[PDB]
From a paper:
The nucleosome containing the centromeric histone H3 variant, CENP-A, is a preferred substrate for SET8 because the H4 N-terminal tails in the CENP-A nucleosome are more accessible than those in the canonical H3 nucleosome. SET8 can efficiently monomethylate the H4K20 residue in the NCP containing CENP-A (NCPCENP-A). We prepared the SET8–NCPCENP-A complex, and the cryo-EM structure was determined at 3.00 Å resolution. However, the overall structure of the SET8–NCPCENP-A complex is quite similar to that of the SET8–NCP complex. Therefore, the structural characteristics of the NCPCENP-A may not affect the specific NCP binding by SET8, except for its preferred H4 N-terminal tail conformation. In the NCPCENP-A, the outward conformation of the H4 N-terminal tail is preferred.
Intriguingly, SET8 primarily promotes H4K20 monomethylation in the nucleosome, although it also possesses the ability to methylate the nucleosome-free H4K20 residue. In the complexes with H3 and CENP-A nucleosomes, SET8 specifically binds the nucleosomal acidic patch via an arginine anchor, composed of the Arg188 and Arg192 residues.
Numbering used by the authors:
A (entry chain F): 16 to 102
B (entry chain B): 23 to 102
C (entry chain A): 46 to 134
D (entry chain E): 45 to 135
E (entry chain K): 187 to 352
F (entry chain C): 12 to 118
G (entry chain G): 10 to 118
H (entry chain D): 33 to 125
Amino acid sequence: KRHRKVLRDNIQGITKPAIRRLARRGGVKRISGLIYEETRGVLKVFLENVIRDAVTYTEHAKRKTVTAMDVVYALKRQGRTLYGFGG
Amino acid sequence: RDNIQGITKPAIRRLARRGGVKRISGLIYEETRGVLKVFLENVIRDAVTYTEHAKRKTVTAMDVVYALKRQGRTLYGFGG
Amino acid sequence: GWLKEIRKLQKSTHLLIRKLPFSRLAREICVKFTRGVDFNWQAQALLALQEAAEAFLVHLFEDAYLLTLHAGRVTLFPKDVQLARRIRG
Amino acid sequence: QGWLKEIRKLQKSTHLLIRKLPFSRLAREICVKFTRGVDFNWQAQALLALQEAAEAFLVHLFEDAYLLTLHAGRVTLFPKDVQLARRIRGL
Amino acid sequence: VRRSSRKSKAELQSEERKRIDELIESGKEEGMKIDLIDGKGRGVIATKQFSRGDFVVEYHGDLIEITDAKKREALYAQDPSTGCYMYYFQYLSKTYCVDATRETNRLGRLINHSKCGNCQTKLHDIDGVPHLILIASRDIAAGEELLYDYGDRSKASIEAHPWLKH
Amino acid sequence: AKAKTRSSRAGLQFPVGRVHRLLRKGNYSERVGAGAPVYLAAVLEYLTAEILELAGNAARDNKKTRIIPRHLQLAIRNDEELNKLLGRVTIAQGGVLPNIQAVLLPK
Amino acid sequence: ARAKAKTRSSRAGLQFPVGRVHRLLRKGNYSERVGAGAPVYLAAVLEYLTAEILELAGNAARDNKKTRIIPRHLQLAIRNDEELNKLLGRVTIAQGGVLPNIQAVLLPK
Amino acid sequence: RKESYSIYVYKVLKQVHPDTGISSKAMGIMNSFVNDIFERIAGEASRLAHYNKRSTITSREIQTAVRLLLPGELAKHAVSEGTKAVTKYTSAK
Amino acid sequence: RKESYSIYVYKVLKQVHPDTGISSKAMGIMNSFVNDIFERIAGEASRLAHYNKRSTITSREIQTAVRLLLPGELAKHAVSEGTKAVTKYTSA
DNA sequence: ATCCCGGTGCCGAGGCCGCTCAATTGGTCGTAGACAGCTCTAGCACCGCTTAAACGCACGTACGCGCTGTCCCCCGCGTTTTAACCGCCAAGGGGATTACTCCCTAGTCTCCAGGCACGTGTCAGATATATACATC
DNA sequence: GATGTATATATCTGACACGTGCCTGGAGACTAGGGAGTAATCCCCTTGGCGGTTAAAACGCGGGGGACAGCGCGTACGTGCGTTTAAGCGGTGCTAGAGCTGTCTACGACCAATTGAGCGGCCTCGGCACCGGGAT
């Protein structure tokens, strides 16, 4: 039984109704249809920054588990101070 | 009194023109004087706090440079 | 129909993107800043990263929709999210 | 033209666009509102640092509030645009 | 005389893209030999120190639209001796299909399916047309077999091929 | 002889001792005054009393008796001073203030 | 003090002062101790960044056909560069002017 | 053994709202808030000390660090409370 | 005895553009830039040392602070420069 | 649809007890910084004069804004389908702790050289006029 | 054909690049100690896998809500010009106040002793969530 071949992207896992719910929480009454790829791009950029700094804070501590304090300090460095994770 | 009116209309217009603005609603002048007064109130409150703490009476250049660095607007050219 | 959802979501506080797809996304981005070696993301750090990403995206959409109510629209186009960022920093 | 020569001329110079003495009097009037009725001397380069900062701020504010009024279809800067460019930045 | 060589990100991405394009249009296929594997059929062993993102192969084939894509797989599947050579991908609200059943001097169609393999497929669009690239997502040594994921979860297919889940 | 904590000498609830130790081992200065920990602890207790008062108010408005992250986000974003202070700060599990632009409501 | 001394900057091949950077790292209360390679690393980084900026500043000054780097040329170099502009984003450069940019929707037809 | 301001935030809570609890998540948020405000005030006081070529963080430096970091009415009231506590601490011996 | 970086920026200039001068205001601006980047890198190294319960600021801490503060290519090249300088310094 | 009301329930919070570590006390010293005093810088004030810039007015026309139409594209709905997720389990890596030792840095003192203020020659660039050309 | 702008020459002027005395800090050598690097251990807690479930995503479709282009009115902004005005510059003055310094005194670091507060494990119970019903 021949099967076809496809792939996934792990960014399309940030699904379309998830961006709809994020928008709606932000107050967005009516969302365009091209805001989804733009939002996945914005999210990937933000994550790239915060995760570069979390992974740096880890690699410096000679660890291999990106603790919650690594991410909290990465956000505190970017200026996104996050309360509630052992700061 | 009315020293904010000393920030003339053509001065705000030249600031805008530098910023790229092509036309300017005649109501942007009072808005810009309000915005400028708020910015100065913040920066001068921090400058005068840095002074009053240093037990001085002349707001130095470093007082204002540290006020700006505190608001997050680091200013290069006057020491640091 | 949209308003029974905006009121329903601005009143709740739970997370919006699912946990597992976001975990796979964060681990796919963490595997290119370590040059292909993977780090055991502590399961309480995926939550912190996700809470930060949701609060960021929600604030970004608040500002974007301040911009799409400015242009007279009600729709939130991509030329908005792209300008609520080019203004913000 | 006319506004276009003024723009090309001002975006290319590096002057201080607000007169020095009116801004001096304004900063000295705000320096009194705090520390009620005690005149702090002002180091003549503190007024320059303060004016450099206020002018870089206002020029960036108009440069950011003109992206909101080319975006809104206008060409004319409005007070709405400045208020929104400030309400987005976080001010 | 002391001059910085910093290679601005625009130039970095441009030179990376030109590198992928020239390595694709040259088809060196440096160090991959086809041999026999104990049960799965054939196998293409890689013999280079592969690492994160380094180029491996191109899944060369014939590119088509979706209306015929959803049909050609079933139409060629009527021959029970065709293996698996056609690849789907959704791109710009449009699906395509890499018709690669006919043997060509490329080594993309010569790979089998796994979920514990060593490579994963990406997309590269050399002047619009998307060529389906394959790069090593992890560190691979010289002497390992090419093995990537077909990503299709047809229920009848997973019933028929228990080695798809492997 | 019999001792009483510095938090009690100052009439605070926060620890003057732990604050002094944190000022010392934090490498903020080569020295630390005697009034510095007391002052900092008094300021911290005041800020926390403010935050917890506003959070208790926002909890009684919802007819609840526990303060939860959402209540802290309400107490913060609604007060002007604190929102200006905790401006860069995201409060996990804090939601957003219900604020739908009046342009959007059906006419 | 025999074996005539060569500055640590000279020993490392830098132009910035390893000695002064060490002294600033010490009397600045950044940490109780300070490594021996910390001043050398930090001074090498500072020299690299200053070379990166003075290179682009001189490029701009010779594009304007001048031979003195001025605040305007530093603002040009920094803001036109893609990464220095991100490192120095919050930073106002006194008498630096702004980048010439009239939005393309403004020009006459 | 990890330190935190849980018991003290709880005492202040029992001061302002006696009949009210605080969930463990809001407890962690108040711990992080107290830690962050402490780091802000103490860092600004360290900076105010080093700017004046002095070495001691005194109540002077903390009062000015508060007057810098906190907005208008928070600043005035926090400075009032700190001064009250310092005079109460040096009065009683 | 006023501290500055003027003569060292002069040296680096005469090393990059050997036939180019620098005005006094641009000298002050480069001075402020060096002071500011030094303050940033040192504060970040201090934060790292405090996070990992260490006591010494070392080349490890300074390298991590450089990698955190400078954007991509600047960070790569600055780390290269600093590593080269440290190896040369410990060799000599 | 959604809030007000009952009753279950459950799980997390609030209180209780034993240990331990760190907060308090007291005494000593050394050094930081408070203070008084002195010098001399530069900030404030004023005033005359120039004149650059602001200003007030008028006019036209560029543009903002409200209205209309049409075309297309979000949204809501219903059905299939899919993959997040929760529990359970198993493993095993690596985080966290601790003990040892060694080497790396602070402290000290002596030496000395480089860099900083200061005086000075000179030249890069900002005008000023003339020449030539771009442009609406 | 003004009206402005690109290009050269003359120049001169304040700012810059450079030589010098010296003095303050940078370098060397040595010692000691304690910070951290290394090794080993324990067990937490992260990863991986499976089954099943079901909540949620995906897809397609209709329709009607909204985006966008066009248009006409009218108003309010830009430009131009003669007038008024206030900034600016140069002087002097002067004097408050910043910067520096020497004394010394109070105040904070340090160190031994101790003891009690707080942190962790145990245990109970009720606040808030959930499932179902009546009212708005």
